[PDB]
RNA sequence: UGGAGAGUUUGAUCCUGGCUCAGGGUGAACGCUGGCGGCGUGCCUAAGACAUGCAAGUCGUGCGGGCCGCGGGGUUUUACUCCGUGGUCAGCGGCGGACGGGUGAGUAACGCGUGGGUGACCUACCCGGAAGAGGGGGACAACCCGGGGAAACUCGGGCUAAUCCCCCAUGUGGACCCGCCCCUUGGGGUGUGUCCAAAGGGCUUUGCCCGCUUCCGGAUGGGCCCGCGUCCCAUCAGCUAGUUGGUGGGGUAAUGGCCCACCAAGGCGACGACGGGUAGCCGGUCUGAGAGGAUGGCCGGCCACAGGGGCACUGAGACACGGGCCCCACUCCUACGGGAGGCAGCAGUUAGGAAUCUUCCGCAAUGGGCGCAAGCCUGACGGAGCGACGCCGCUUGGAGGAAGAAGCCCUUCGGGGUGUAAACUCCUGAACCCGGGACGAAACCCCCGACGAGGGGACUGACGGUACCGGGGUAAUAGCGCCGGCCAACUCCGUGCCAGCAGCCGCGGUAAUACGGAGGGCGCGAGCGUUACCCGGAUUCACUGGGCGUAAAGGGCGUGUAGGCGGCCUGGGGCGUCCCAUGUGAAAGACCACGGCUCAACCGUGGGGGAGCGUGGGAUACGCUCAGGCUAGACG
């Protein structure tokens, strides 16, 4: 299936995560469909995490089933919140 | 570093106290028989100690070696022109505590006109390098307790070098007694 | 690692004053004045005509010594300069200057470049809040260096300040002599620095 | 957009099959000069409606045989057999230089 | 064999450098001194690295 | 040695057997239908064909033929039967045929 | 935004021209030397053998069963029993084991790269919607007994559940033949006829949750086919017999010579087939002014193989790395009849070999799988260990301080050198010890809100007591190469065509700026040099940008085929060619900008560029092509 998931890049002890859309059976670094956002765990930057919302929503609609952490991140950003 | 310890009963041992025979795996080189095993705080220190030991031994060995072809005018000539022909042999045993014994036994067995020579004596399996060496030197490969590897054996067979495999020391000794010959 | 070892020998080798001690390298003592010739035996000998390569090499060495850096680092800096657009020599020089130690030296925080570097290393030098201990720190313009909180009451620093009390600073620099502060303002151009080095020669040397 | 090609019917020697010479003029990746370079394609003609010496439009298609992956779209112009003749001559020459 | 007098035996274990010699016919290889059975050149003090001899103990 | 994936193999064996039962029987039925069609028995033949079709569908439903393969098979059978019927018969029961 | 040459055939010159060298780099290695820290990275050899440990399972919210445990009895006890249970243990049943991880032998091929196509197709799980889920039957493990067999294991009889299987009913639908319609290859719609559905558990149970069955729509994942690009050898010239096409059928999810029957006799080839060798391919990397040239390590994709070969089974997906069967090879036991194996998973063992790490800790983060969930699993991964194997960062002090100690070295005997170097004064304070001490980890979980959004709660650390901060606190490893010209830097002693050096010219046969040492210098520096390969210089394969009277080089000429190439004018077409637009050209890198780790490496964010390739439009000068004419070429 298709998942919204976090791809580790970066350095040892300096992790960086790509909030990304990809197939379930892939390398956690692998050929992903689209880069929707990015997240730094270490909170080192002011704009530490950011995801484009509309694209994410579209993906969800299509049926992109997110990872739990990813979902949390999305919620934090303001994707799942509706009015 | 200690990888595995295994008693004579045939059981895996994680912990071994004072006074039990353990099959200790984890030494980078094959240590000598009756060598005192010692504990170290770290690895670097151990390495340093080893280096120091090597320095102590090796330098001395070198020195010992160096006081042999002293005169090269006449003495060298005497030592290059050899009357009694020598037979070369290269041994490979199963343990450190048998190879030495074998050597001791065959050092006596040298009174004949043909004088036996050990060029390479190590414990373990024969290989293609050994075969190559034999070819270079005209030497025999003798084995006690260790069977030859298939490839190695094949190589030995086809290239035309003396390959030997044994069960008893006595057998080996007997075999050696045939190698001096007589021509007449 | 540093050069480390005999200093004014290098100066002697070039034949132009290199100011690698500060004082004494100012007085009749840098060995430029007492003796002006290259070190070791054939220094006082007949000076032979040097090859085209050689002159350039000498110049490069002079430069490196003046800035007190490892060769690899220097090379890297040069490469970076080349990559960036402008005047590959002047820009390079500016970049070199931007090395924290050099800046410190300029601001009169320490009387010698090596000394400055040492000071920087030993947490005595602060760049906008944090004590920075690596002289390879490159400072981008409009930025504040200061003598550290707990190093403000040490004798050497005071002496340095006194020395630089009265005598003015470079146009790319400003220093608060009261509170042991020093802003690096402009990025130092070549025209500002009346250095004995010719960058062109260095560039040529590098080329092949 | 299926691959649509221009070429001449060089051989009708088989049932339902037309052989088509497609000549492509591409420049050399290094020397910058155009090479008039040909390739043979075996095309499906369900009627034998097309004949020796016809220039036709050949469409990339779902396969009908092992290297017969082309449908014949339409006939462009019929009777410029000169090219065909040239090809034949070339083929004949190819026979010559064996032994 | 580079070095002021070899140590090499008749069934000596060696390591080969390669890199020609302009004098010698059929010969394209240096023997690298300081390994296996080719021990370091005794009483070298300047160009030790090429000939594999250890640092001398100074007084 | 030894892993709990032997279970899977065992399962597959059983499934294989069931699949074989489904498939071989279906094939046999098809053959029978064809034979019936051969001479022109029609009504019984039609019934047999229908039965075969049903079996095929069942197989598809389970984990045997599946997908469009079953459909293809049906088409192959049915068309063949129809062709055979052209040599005497015509739809007597109504049955598998579209009349 | 970018391009250095030089030494050398000679008595000297000019060239032609090879060789050699500086430059940079490597998955390197070796030698000497060796403080740390960050980060990257480490069998390039035998795809040789492999131990040991682990590397893939999980669901009791699918189901029966054994072993135990409890709460309570029925049970005097003992049973047996009943549930709630707590775990286990194995079985069935399902989902995953086709992902992840490795290696690069083969394969020079639609294998890949690339741009399309698929009216010739699949897609379990995911989401979107639609419609359902009515009844009845059955076997099979486990289990019990009974054997056979040394073991591996295994056959026989019986029992039993279930989301296992079957059968009937319904039909939203779909499946198929036939017809019709619209399309245009098998796409969509419809009619008659035939065929096809399913299955349940969970509770806060009259209510929802998870699952279910059929379908269409999507989503991703592919399968298959084609356009072009894809190493050397012409001393490999003809290759082909399912081979090239057809008709029919089989087989496939689907086309097709994939396979078979039958008919036809083709098909490919010098625009390089077939054959041999070589080689995974690329995104890239290294180099280079660029064009190119070499390479494909790590990282990312794709392929291919899991001792060699062959083949199926099960499923959404394998011809299946830690499944199966079979033959062979080999290792391992055998009660000689037979089985067990497979590290190209991590670690490790050997063996080859110049050479390559730890039988490490962890599920904490991310991701995987299963699961309602907790949670279980995870040698993916996160990290730590070792190696100066790369790259970067810092230390080995700083400030004084002789018209110049000693030591050593030369000297023309005055002196010079080492050298402000040292000693010595002053100052700082890596190491080091204490004191603290992380970011990374806020969620899934619970409760309130409807199990939605939203609100609060709590736990959760391998790294690691590490990084890092606060206090203290020692002056605290310098080595290697070279020093005749290239080429930076020179003297003396010793040696006497010897010993030696050398990459090249060549140095050495008694005053050697080339050998050994010493001083002195110079280059770099925790490194430096040697070796090996690659590029560069090498415009020494020349497209940019070489030449061929005499240097290497014009075939001995003729005619002539392919091929290549082409006069002038006018008009079209618009293939090349240009352009505009768009789509692609993934990410990582490379480039620019900013930002994080005290800097830098490293990394992150954003941006631009980017040959090429498709699609749509345009342009017609120049090729190409068609048409018409001309007379300068050519022919008569
Ligand atoms: Zn000075």
Q: How large is the radius of gyration of chain C?
A: 18 Å
Major sheet details of chain C: 5 strands, antiparallel
CATH T-level topology of the largest domain in chain C? Ribosomal Protein S4 Delta 41, Chain A, domain 1
Estimate the helix proportion of chain B, in percent: 25-40%
Instruction: Quickly give the structural class of chain C.
Output: alpha+beta
Number of strands of chain B: 6
Specify the overall morphology of chain C: globular
Commentary on this structure:
This is part of a larger assembly, with chains A (83 residues), B (184 residues), C (208 residues), D (99 residues), E (59 residues) and F (99 residues). Chain A has one domain: Ribosomal protein S16 (S16 Ribosomal Protein, Chain: A, 2-Layer Sandwich). Helices cover 24% and strands 28% of the residues of chain A. Chain A has helices spanning 53-62, 68-77; strands at residues 2-8, 17-23, 34-39, 49-51. A four-stranded antiparallel sheet of chain A has the order 1-2-3-4, with helices on one face. The radius of gyration of chain A is 12 Å and the shape is flat. The N and C termini of chain A lie far apart (29 Å). Chain B has helices at 43-66, 75-80, 96-108, 128-137, 150-159, 169-178, and strands at 5-6, 12-13, 86-93, 115-123, 139-144, 162-166. In chain B, the strands form two sheets. Chain B has a four-stranded parallel sheet with strand order 4-3-5-6, sandwiched between helices. Chain B is globular and about 65 Å long. By secondary structure, chain C is an alpha+beta fold. Chain C has two domains: 7-96 and 194-207, Ribosomal protein S4/S9, N-terminal domain (Ribosomal Protein S4 Delta 41, Chain A, domain 1), CATH 1.10.1050.10; 97-184, Structural Genomics Hypothetical 15.5 Kd Protein In mrcA-pckA Intergenic Region, Chain A, CATH 3.10.290.10. Chain C has helices at 8-14, 52-67, 71-83, 90-97, 100-106, 113-121, 155-164, 199-207, and strands spanning 125-127, 130-131, 143-147, 173-176, 181-184. In chain C, a hairpin with a 4-residue loop joins strand 4 and strand 5 (181-184). Chain E is mostly loops. Chain E contains one helix and no strands. The radius of gyration of chain E is 13 Å and the shape is globular. Chains in contact: B-E. Bound molecules: zinc ion (ZN). Zinc ion (ZN) binds next to helix 1 of chain C. Chain C binds one RNA strand of 636 nucleotides through helix 1, helix 2, helix 3, helix 6 and strand 2. The PDB classes it as ribosome. Keywords: ribosome, translation, initiation factors, 30S, IF1, IF2, IF3, tRNAi, PIC, Thermus thermophilus. The entry is titled "Structure of bacterial 30S-IF1-IF2-IF3-mRNA-tRNA translation pre-initiation complex(state-III)".
